[PDB]
Amino acid sequence: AGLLNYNFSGNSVQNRIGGNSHYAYLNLQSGLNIGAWRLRDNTTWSYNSSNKWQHINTWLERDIIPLRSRLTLGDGYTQGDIFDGINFRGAQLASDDNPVIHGIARGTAQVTIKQNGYDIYNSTVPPGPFTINDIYAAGNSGDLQVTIKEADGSTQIFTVPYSSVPLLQREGHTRYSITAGEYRSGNAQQEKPRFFQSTLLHGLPAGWTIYGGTQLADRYRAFNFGIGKNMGALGALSVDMTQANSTLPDDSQHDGQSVRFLYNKSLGTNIQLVGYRYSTSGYFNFADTTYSRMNGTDYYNLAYNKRGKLQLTVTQQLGRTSTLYLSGSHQTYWGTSNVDEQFQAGLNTAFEDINWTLSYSLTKNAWQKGRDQMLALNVNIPFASASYSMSHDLNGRMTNLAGVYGTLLEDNNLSYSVQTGYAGGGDGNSGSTGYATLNYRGGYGNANIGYSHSDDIKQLYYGVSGGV
Template identity: 65%
Template sequence: MSYLDYGAGSDKMTTLDTRGKTLKRTMLTPLAMLLVASTFSARADNYFNPRFLSDDPESVADLSGFEKGLEAPPGTYRVDIYMNDGYMSTRDVTFEYSTDGKRLEPCLTRSQLATLGVNTLTLPDIAVMKSTACVPFTRLIADSSSSFDVGRQRLNISVPQAFMGNQARGYIAPELWDNGITAGLLNYNYTGSEVRSQNGGTRNYSYLNLQSGLNVGAWRLRDNSTWSYSSGAASNENRWQHVNTWLERDITAWRSRLTVGDSYTAGDIFEGINFRGIQVASDDNMLPDSQRGFAPVIHGIARGTARVSIKQNGYEIYQTTVPPGAFTIGDLYAAGNSGDLQVTVKEADGSVQVFTVPFSSVPMLQREGQVKFAATAGQYRSGNGMQDKPTFFQGTSLWGLPDGWTVYGGTRASSDYRSFNVGLGKNLGYLGAVSADITQANATLPDDTRHQGQSLRFLYSKSLNDTGTNLQLVGYRYSTQGFYTLADTAWHRMSGYTVVSEDGIVNVKPKFTDYYNLNYSKRGRLQATVTQQVGRSSTIYLTGSHQSYWNTGRADEQLQIGYNSTITDISWGLSYSLSKNAWSDDKDQLLAFNINIPFSHWMRSDTRSAFKNASASYNTSTDFRGRTAGTAGLYGTLLEDNNLSYSVQTGYASGGSGTSGGTGNAGLNYRGTYGNSNIGYSHSGDYRQLYYGVSGGVLAHENGVTFSQPLNDTSVLIKAPGAGHVGVENQTGVRTDWRGYAVLPYAMDYRENRVALNTDSLANNVELEEAVVSVVPTRGAVVRAEFKARVGMKVLMTLTRDGKPVPFGSIVSYEAGQSGSIVADGGQVYLTGLSPAGKIKVKWGESANESCTATYSLPADSQNRALSYSSAVCR
């Protein structure tokens, strides 16, 4: 038998498994079907005979309110809202009786209607109503209607297109954006390793990245610092480095963002640079998805277990440890949104690979009428000690015109540099998208010589759906001999480089990075990113660039090409990479093959084996200098939440300048409620390496301090006091702490985020009034998602009055009327959140003699049971 439970502010129903083991939220139960389908669907001119439910009419509550066709009583329901058959959002909506009392009408305010796309300004009767008043829009908007599907909890609204505004699909009114709570934030990421050689030498490395912040209203204060430490035979280092500090906030009316402090300019018109100063720039995230017009993915190959470091504009922005073979990094927390990325792969034996990933923007097309702008004033800022910090000003804008045209341009100026850009873009339809622009620049170089020149840029992108070809970006830039950039004028000297040491390796010439030579100005640069679909399950990709210089035949060359394919659930790939700097004779090449076979390939889909989520892998690589390496391994996930991942690999390495021999590594990575941790061990030839790390977030707020996994820019604080150790849906390892607090470490800016708790993980004495909350955070916000938990016992109680069960369909309320349930047959009612003793009120009609109060006292051992049984007399 099932029983109905009406929670506070919600008339959703709860099904009780009479075995007392499982409680599930549902929309309709068998009893509800009897009560609703048979009773509530009666028409106004029909009379429902209560004898269908009982021979004694007095044992049935007053159901006259449902004889007019109502399927549910008035109240607040969480519903999915569909406007003109399109999904809009999920939220709580209050429903009231219509004027004829035959149906329920939603109580929507003027701003809520505007959020749904209704142009309320063109409707005088609605425009003059109070902002908090319920708008009877079905009576004020001709041919509009609403219907509430109780079973599906779906509200359908229909409004003629003539009364709809011009908001794009997915538009969320700024009034609904949440700036979040006042909070202090700290992100930490620590990695360390110890490398030992058979000759007794030991090298230790440590790296710590701290990202701290403070949120007050719409203001966001952020700071980013790093600490690195190394010790060994070659050198010792102990260094703190401040990366950047900035203060920012939204300017909603302009759909833009104000930034004060250390930030970066966009790389759409001029090359992106870091600066310290002030900037006001458009933020496309404030636009709905349908109106939004690039961070790169790093591909590389490691010979063994290696540390990967990524620098941008002279600052280290990322560091991690990767296993042997091909690796992909797609989660950069970059200090800049443009500027080439310098990737350094340092092996356990001290050998180093260095390559550059070009970072450019796609064609700058804007929608018709859309304007994107940025104005910046400040000091050029570089992490390279060989550059000065000139003060500069920059202004750029892009304006979308009719027929797919976009015009754009800008200017950048300092004491030694002045440039002006103008360009035009066009949507060519089937032929793709193209843009072209020219920049005129006047520069004074470190040797005090003055130069002037022009740079012509051409960008093109196209997806050939019929052939599966995607030209993501094809670009060419031609610069005259006298063309220089602002960064060129900041160098102390006309040429230079940085030396990278190779720890523990003797008789090997050092590696050089950060090359530049202003005597050979840039001439032509070709870059391309192309993917080609082959059949249904294979892809070829190519990314590359070629930078030539005036007065020399040397060139920078970068190339990555690969083939990826799947056979059922088995995946394999072949890749090649090339990196060469114009001012060095070294050329780094790697050819690699990898294959991955999941164990589930040989298992039934319903298996519970611990190896269900395991896979076997093999990869091999060669650098064309006689050094080859290969590994075979096993990796997968464990635990109920799959938050413990493991990997074990063994292999070989031979040839080259390093030592040869067997290789192997094993590692564990745990994602928990209070943070992440990892540990691993590897050996290669004469070297042994132990590596480890911890990362996480700390959030300080008015209710205390909550520890979490690493925080993204925007996050959600889950507040559910009393609901401790409850899982968060679709989040690996995220659970509420012992107090009922948790942090959802990332959320989408200016979008509706659905936050749901897993009710199956609730304790026996806890129940949530609502398990789902929706929030719309602004960028950088910490928004609160609050859940109300009833903490108390779950009881199946039998209520009697004058020796008879209380009337079927009576409403039982408790907790000062804030919670309630419906009485089923025999006076039985399911109640949650009860204290050991107290009073409950029963009501089955509107008159004074159609209610009573019962005093109950539960058995002493009720708190140890999932479900208790009791009875009480109502007087």
């Protein structure tokens, strides 16, 4: 049986001065079955008219039952549970065992998520808080750089790190992954070099788990050694150390060490995750060695490497009505006092009388110093059956106000929301901004279309997402 899943997004913006442009994106996935051999392919088409195809993953896998493993051939990706997740081109013999992004938009913004240089998700978003959920990242092991391009007041860029749960294994169970080939990047700044990566996980009695890994290259050597216990009550803890001997593009030899801590809490929904990784001055990843020293946003420099990485992802259930999420990350670098901070907090209350939702977004990157603090508040009051909406946005030194209605038609599937209000605040002048959207969701055969207008900018977007 063959399966396919696509995600289309096309917007045509029209404004004065001559900034009118048309952009279209298509995130398609294709799966083919020709007798045990499972072919999987993921390609992204990007178009910007101020037109290139981008291949991410194309592999052909075979499941081996007698050995409890699966052998994949071609363009695939490695699991980033022990080391940093990397894309490859070759073969992988791994045992066949076994992210949500939050943010607030100013107005009509273009959601663009990129992982490993590859463009994975593209969509258009109305002002306020948004949740994605539907995206399946190709090469889901590394960090995800998500940027929302606004019209005119163009941007806020922030990267979301790979969330990892403490490495736990059942007693007697062994999970291994051996791969050999060359390093794939997709991003036009890296080299492709041959490597050999082999990881191992073993379950120990009394909830303990021993795990290690080795990734050898022509220019890079690493070793891992770690333990992880399962308590259940109070959650789980996992500690691992990594030794790395890396030679940079300038042939400079470096000795590096990195300690890693992972914490979890037992599972309404009460997910808790605290992760801390501290790296030395001479510590570099496998991706760091493959580079051209300097290029150039998305600016990299090997002189300022990663130091301390704090992560926090907590969820609290304050009754059936109230749901609170709090996700945060912090990154420090050697040399400069610049840091990378990403913080998302959403507080929600939903029941058959009124709908309250408070949202907070704190984004701070290096080289910019400036931090974007966003406060969002949406109030929905249900009453043929309509629902009155009240949305307010506060970003930095600018404000946005709106108050109107929005409900669903055709029993359940069809939905419409025609917003109106004023937008202005800090830059430019105080004008009036309003939009109208139409979305139809069948058996995962979605089709959305919207029209937006301000005092100078006009938007017209369309999107189709279908999965078989």
